[PDB]
Amino acid sequence: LCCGPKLAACGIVLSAWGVIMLIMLGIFFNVHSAVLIEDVPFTEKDFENGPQNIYNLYEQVSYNCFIAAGLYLLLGGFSFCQVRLN
Amino acid sequence: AHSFALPVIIFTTFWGLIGIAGPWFVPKGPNRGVIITMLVATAVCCYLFWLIAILAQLNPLFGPQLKNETIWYVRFLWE
Amino acid sequence: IRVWFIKVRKMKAIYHTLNLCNIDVTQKCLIAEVWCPVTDLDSIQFALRRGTEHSGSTVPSILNRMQTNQTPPTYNKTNKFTHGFQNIVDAYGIGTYREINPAPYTVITFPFLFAVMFGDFGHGILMTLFAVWMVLRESRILSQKHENEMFSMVFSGRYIILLMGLFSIYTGLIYNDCFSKSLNIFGSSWSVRPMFTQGNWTEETLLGSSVLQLNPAIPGVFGGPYPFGIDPIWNIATNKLTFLNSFKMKMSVILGIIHMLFGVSLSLFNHIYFKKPLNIYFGFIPEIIFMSSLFGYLVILIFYKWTAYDAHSSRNAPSLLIHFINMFLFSYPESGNAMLYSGQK
Amino acid sequence: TGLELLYLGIFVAFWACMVVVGICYTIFDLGFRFDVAWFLTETSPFMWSNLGIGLAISLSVVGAAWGIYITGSSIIGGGVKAPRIKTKNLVSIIFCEAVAIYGIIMAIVISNMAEPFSATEPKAIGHRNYHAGYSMFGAGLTVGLSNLFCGVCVGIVGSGAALADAQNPSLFVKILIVEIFGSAIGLFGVIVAILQTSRVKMG
Amino acid sequence: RSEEMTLAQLFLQSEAAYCCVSELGELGKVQFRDLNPDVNVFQRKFVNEVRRCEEMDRKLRFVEKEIRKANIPIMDTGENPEVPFPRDMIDLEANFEKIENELKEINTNQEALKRNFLELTELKFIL
Numbered sequence: 001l002c003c004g005p006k007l008a009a010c011g012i013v014l015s016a017w018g019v020i021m022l023i024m025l026g027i028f029f030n031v032h033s034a035v036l037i038e039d040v041p042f043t044e045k046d047f048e049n050g051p052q053n054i055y056n057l058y059e060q061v062s063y064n065c066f067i068a069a070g071l072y073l074l075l076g077g078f079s080f081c082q083v084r085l086n
Numbered sequence: 087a088h089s090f091a092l093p094v095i096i097f098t099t100f101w102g103l104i105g106i107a108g109p110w111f112v113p114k115g116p117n118r119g120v121i122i123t124m125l126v127a128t129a130v131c132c133y134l135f136w137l138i139a140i141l142a143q144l145n146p147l148f149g150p151q152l153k154n155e156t157i158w159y160v161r162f163l164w165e
Numbered sequence: 166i167r168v169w170f171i172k173v174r175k176m177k178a179i180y181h182t183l184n185l186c187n188i189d190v191t192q193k194c195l196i197a198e199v200w201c202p203v204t205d206l207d208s209i210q211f212a213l214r215r216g217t218e219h220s221g222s223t224v225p226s227i228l229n230r231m232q233t234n235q236t237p238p239t240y241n242k243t244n245k246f247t248h249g250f251q252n253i254v255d256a257y258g259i260g261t262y263r264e265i266n267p268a269p270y271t272v273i274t275f276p277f278l279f280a281v282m283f284g285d286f287g288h289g290i291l292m293t294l295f296a297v298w299m300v301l302r303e304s305r306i307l308s309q310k311h312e313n314e315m316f317s318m319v320f321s322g323r324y325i326i327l328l329m330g331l332f333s334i335y336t337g338l339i340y341n342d343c344f345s346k347s348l349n350i351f352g353s354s355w356s357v358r359p360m361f362t363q364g365n366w367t368e369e370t371l372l373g374s375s376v377l378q379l380n381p382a383i384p385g386v387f388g389g390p391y392p393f394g395i396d397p398i399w400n401i402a403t404n405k406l407t408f409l410n411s412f413k414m415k416m417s418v419i420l421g422i423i424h425m426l427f428g429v430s431l432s433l434f435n436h437i438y439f440k441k442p443l444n445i446y447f448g449f450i451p452e453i454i455f456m457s458s459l460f461g462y463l464v465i466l467i468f469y470k471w472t473a474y475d476a477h478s479s480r481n482a483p484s485l486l487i488h489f490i491n492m493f494l495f496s497y498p499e500s501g502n503a504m505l506y507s508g509q510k
Numbered sequence: 511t512g513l514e515l516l517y518l519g520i521f522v523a524f525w526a527c528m529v530v531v532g533i534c535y536t537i538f539d540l541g542f543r544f545d546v547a548w549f550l551t552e553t554s555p556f557m558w559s560n561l562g563i564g565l566a567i568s569l570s571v572v573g574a575a576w577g578i579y580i581t582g583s584s585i586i587g588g589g590v591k592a593p594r595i596k597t598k599n600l601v602s603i604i605f606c607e608a609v610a611i612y613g614i615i616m617a618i619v620i621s622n623m624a625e626p627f628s629a630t631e632p633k634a635i636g637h638r639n640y641h642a643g644y645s646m647f648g649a650g651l652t653v654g655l656s657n658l659f660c661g662v663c664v665g666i667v668g669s670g671a672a673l674a675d676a677q678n679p680s681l682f683v684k685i686l687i688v689e690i691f692g693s694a695i696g697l698f699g700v701i702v703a704i705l706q707t708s709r710v711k712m713g
Numbered sequence: 714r715s716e717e718m719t720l721a722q723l724f725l726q727s728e729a730a731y732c733c734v735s736e737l738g739e740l741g742k743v744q745f746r747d748l749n750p751d752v753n754v755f756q757r758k759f760v761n762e763v764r765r766c767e768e769m770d771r772k773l774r775f776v777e778k779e780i781r782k783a784n785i786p787i788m789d790t791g792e793n794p795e796v797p798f799p800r801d802m803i804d805l806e807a808n809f810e811k812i813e814n815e816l817k818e819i820n821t822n823q824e825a826l827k828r829n830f831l832e833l834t835e836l837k838f839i840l
Contacts, residue, residue, distance in 0.1 A: 036159045037401045038346055051162045088354055093392035120247065123269045131277045132335065136393075138419065139339055141468070142412040144390050145475050147482065149380030150355060150402035154373030160356045166812070167787050168794060169805065170773055176796045177766040179735050184759045185747040186726075195726035200744040202716050210723065212740050216733030226733060230721040237719045238744065257597050263714040486619070490704060501711070 001085035008083045015076030019069050026065025034058030090144075097136060105129030196228075200238055237262055247272065249322050265435045273328070274424075280332035281420065286343035289333030296327035339394050347397035354389040355398045356380065377403065382476035415467050422460045429453050463489065470505065551632040555643025555712070556624075562650025563621055566703070569654030570613025570661070577606040577665025584669040592676045599675060601686060602668025605693055609661045612700050616653050619704070620646055625713035642712035649703040656699020664692040731798050769806055772813045779816055 003011075029039055033055055042061060047054050108125040112118050152160075186197040201209055210227070217226050239260055241251045250272045260266070280289070299306075300323055311317065319326075341347040358366070364384040369376075382388055399405050429452055436444040466485055474482060483505045491497065497510075535544065581602045589595045623642065629635040667688045675682040727733065737743055757763070780787065796802075 032349070033163070035163055035349060036156045037349060037397050040401075047158070051159075054159070087386075088352065088389050088392055090390050090392075093390075117244070117246070120269060120272070124273050127270065127273045131274070135281075135336070135339055135416075138416050139394055139412075140390055140392070141471050142415070143396065144471065145473075146382050146388050147474070147476060147479050149382050149387065150398050151377055151379055151404040152356060152398075152402060154370050154376070154378065156401060157356075157358065157370055157373060157378065161358045164353055164356065165359065166773070166776065166809070167789050168791060169809070170777070171789075172794055172796055173766065173769050173773060175735075175738075176798075176802070177763070177770065179731060179738065179796065180759055180762045180766060182738070182745050183731065183734055184757050184763070185745055186758075187747065188750065188752070188758075190726075190758070193726035195730065196722070196724060197745055197747045198720070198722060199724065200719050200746065201721065201742065203718060205740075205742045206721070208740055208742065209737070212736045213723065213733060215736045216729070217727070219732040219736075220727055220729035222728050224725075224727055226725050226727050226730075227723050228725050230718070230723075232718065232720050235720070237716065239715055242715070490619075490708070494705070494708070496708070 001082075003079070003082035003085075005083050005086075008079045011079040012076055012083070015072050015079060018072035019076065022065050022069040022072060026062050026069070029058065029062030029065065034062065094140075097133070101129050101133040105133075202240070239264075241266070241268070246324055249325055250275070252321070253325070263438070265431060270427075270431075276325070276329040276332045278420075279329050280336040281416075283329075283333050284336035284340050284342060285345075286334060286337030289330050289335075289337050292326060292330030292333055294330075296323070296330050299323055300327065341394035341397060341400070347395065347400040349397040351392075353396060353398050354391065355387065355396060357386065360384070360386055382479075388476060419464050419467065422456075422464055426453070426456055426461075429456060466505065473506075551640075553643075555635075555639045555646075558643035558647035559624065562647040563617060564650070565654040566620060566650035567610075567613050567617045567654075570610050570657035573658035573661025574606050574610040574613075576658075577609070577661040577668065578603060580662075580665035581606065581668035581672060585672045588673050588676045594679075595672065595676055598682060599668075599672040602664065602672065602689060605664050605689065606661055606668070608693070609657050609664070609696055612696060613653065613657055616649075616700055616703055620649055620707060623707075623710055623712045627713075639712060642710045645707045645710055649706045652706070653699050653703035656702075657696045660692060660696030660699070663695075664689065667692060729798070735796060735798075765806075769809065772809055776809075776812060776816065 032038060034042075039058060039061075042054075042057060044053065044057055105126055105128075108129075109122045112121055183197075186195045189195075213226055217224060220226075239262060241247075241255065243251050247268055251268045253275075254267055254271060283289075299320060303323070306320065337343060361380075361384065364381075369378055380387075399408065429449065433445065433449045433453075436449065463485070466488075470483070470485060481503055483503055485505070487502055488505065491502075535541075585595065585599055585602075623646075627635065627639060629639075671682055671685040671689060674685060724733075754760075777787075797805075
């Protein structure tokens with residue numbers, strides 16, 4: 001019915017891809033603690049004192065990945081529900 | 087720190103093992119030659135590509151160019 | 166009446182093909198010559214027995230074998246796997262009677278070269294996932310009508326896309342390319358700043374806010390080979406393009422020369438089977454010698470330079486390309502380029 | 511044609527201005543202000559080098575495109591009543607791209623030898639850098655123009671052969687002789703561009 | 714090689730060679746080639762049957778065209794039949810001609826349709 005399956009299949013695969021990739025990128029940030037090779041982006045113009053501020057900020061950055069994963073998973077569930085409308 | 091004789095031995099032995107043993111122990115059927123060619127040419131191309139990629143790094147000439155932020159960060163990550 | 170349409174086309178074809186028979190009917194000389202393979206003769210004579218069974222004349226309806234010197238047609242007996250790759254080669258040219266079949270080697274060396282051209286991890290994973298989807302659902306899609314002709318020709322190359330994705334995943338692993346970023350798996354060996362402080366390297370990073378501060382090779386513990394692929398540090402180096410260009414150009418040239426020698430060595434089989442001593446003696450030999458002498462030397466020189474010159478010899482490191490230009494132009498300046506190895510003249 | 515008239519007007523005005531200016535200056539004993547030395551010594555060698563580098567690929571690509579279209583249009587059009595000619599007549603396109611391949615290789619080769627210097631006046635730069643810049647410009651220009659004309663000739667004969675092949679199968683295999691003889695001039699251009707810059711030691 | 718020999722000849726004329734060649738075609742593992750003289754297509758021993766077949770195809774093409782203009786889908790999922798060589802086929806084609814003839818008269822009734830428009834146009838001069 002609403003949000004026909006023809007595009008809902010594509011939506012489901014897209015949501016699965018989003019969940020998986022965002023979760024893995026967040027885990028790579030946290031576990032490796034944002035090695036500059038795998039993590040260039042950040043927001044700090046002053047770090048000359050020590051690395052602890054850098055690590056804290058990179059943890060803060062990596063936190064958002066799991067919120068993105070949750071949103072993608074909810075999207076996938078919504079699309080799966082729309083598929084069941086037959 | 088990394089070793090060089092150990093990886094070359096391990097990967098050369100693995101690729102010799104597959105590329106030589108696989109052909110000898112195939113079932114006697116209609117798809118024998120196809121699978122033999124597939125596995126053998128696989129092992130050949132695979133191992134050659136790895137060998138070129140690894141020898142291209144042995145005995146480097148000039149080091150990398152690293153930004154100052156990376157120079158600061160690599161202090162307290164690789165150590 | 167659609168069934169009648171099928172029947173009408175069938176009898177029309179039957180009469181059209183029976184028209185081809187001989188131009189005489191005396192003594193019942195209505196005969197037509199047929200191309201037929203060897204592995205299917207039993208079914209053919211079984212068909213003849215069926216035809217005589219439908220007939221009330223009770224006659225053998227057979228004739229003896231004969232041979233002439235015409236050109237027989239060729240048929241590639243495909244199965245579920247080799248068909249997708251045989252159709253790809255037949256699209257350009259049809260092999261002669263007993264031509265060296267190129268599908269058995271092509272079936273693998275094609276996705277390998279593709280993966281060299283398309284060496285990325287994530288994209289390869291996506292392609293192999295699509296391959297798995299399309300392979301596993303084959304039965305339903307085959308018994309289904311689809312308006313998308315693009316999808317039909319995509320679906321034709323099932324194992325093509327599968328093997329292509331597999332080798333793409335591999336070559337993504339070997340470059341240490343994964344969505345354009347390396348995966349530091351089991352260690353780096355290049356940058357050690359605490360060891361770098363030994364070599365008069367301190368306080369520079371205050372000016373580091375506006376400079377680049379090159380890293381040298383071998384202040385004592387640097388260098389070293391990564392056991393698998395490209396060292397991840399190269400992925401973040403600003404001058405990565407130079408080394409990547411060198412390595413990729415050399416790999417491409419080496420791959421291309423072995424492909425060609427493969428070609429000519431395979432040709433030698435083609436000629437020796439057909440019993441053509443002239444072609445082997447004054448054909449294959451000069452061409453293979455020419456190919457070898459002209460470029461196997463370049464391959465071996467590249468490998469020698471790779472395994473010979475260390476970091477401390479960075480001054481006046483010989484250049485191979487200029488030596489090849491002098492190979493072609495026969496020019497030997499007294500200076501300007503040192504000999505790569507003694508006795509090169 | 512308006513565009514041709516515009517081009518002719520600009521060209522004639524330019525040359526008339528040149529002639530009149532030259533004559534009045536020569537009559538006016540002002541030959542000391544025509545010091546071509548300053549004109550060809552103020553110019554940096556790197557400008558000449560980089561112009562040559564750009565042209566050595568640009569003109570080759572232009573020729574490749576010209577030949578590509580000139581043969582492809584006829585190949586595609588003439589196969590409607592003979593689909594057999596699609597794959598038989600792909601040699602011309604291959605050569606039209608081989609021209610650009612040679613151009614790229616030459617660009618890579620000449621791109622070397624670009625070590626900067628610090629001199630800022632003619633007396634300090636020296637003869638060597640001037641020779642380097644001029645030689646590199648000349649090599650780039652000659653390779654570019656040679657490959658351009660080569661590609662055009664290749665494309666024209668490829669079109670002719672492709673169009674003629676649809677009449678009789680036994681034609682193309684012998685009409686390709688002119689096709690193969692096309693590429694020799696581009697090869698000669700590459701050889702001369704190599705030789706002209708074989709003794710540059712800029713740095 | 715792909716094959717060892719491919720020019721054996723195991724075919725002889727009979728009074729029902731039609732059934733033999735039909736079953737061989739059903740096998741789908743042979744190809745036919747002959748007539749080196751390259752005689753004209755209208756000097757043939759079997760020209761009359763080809764002409765009859767062409768007539769059947771023309772009639773059949775007309776009826777399927779009319780069906781497709783009716784926008785009536787055709788279903789083709791049944792079995793592959795066997796051709797009835799004996800004279801029964803003749804009777805069948807006779808029936809087919811009757812079908813075509815009906816279509817002819819239907820087009821004659823489309824003459825009536827023209828008359829309709831000769832009045833619908835008339836309605837547009839109501840003013």
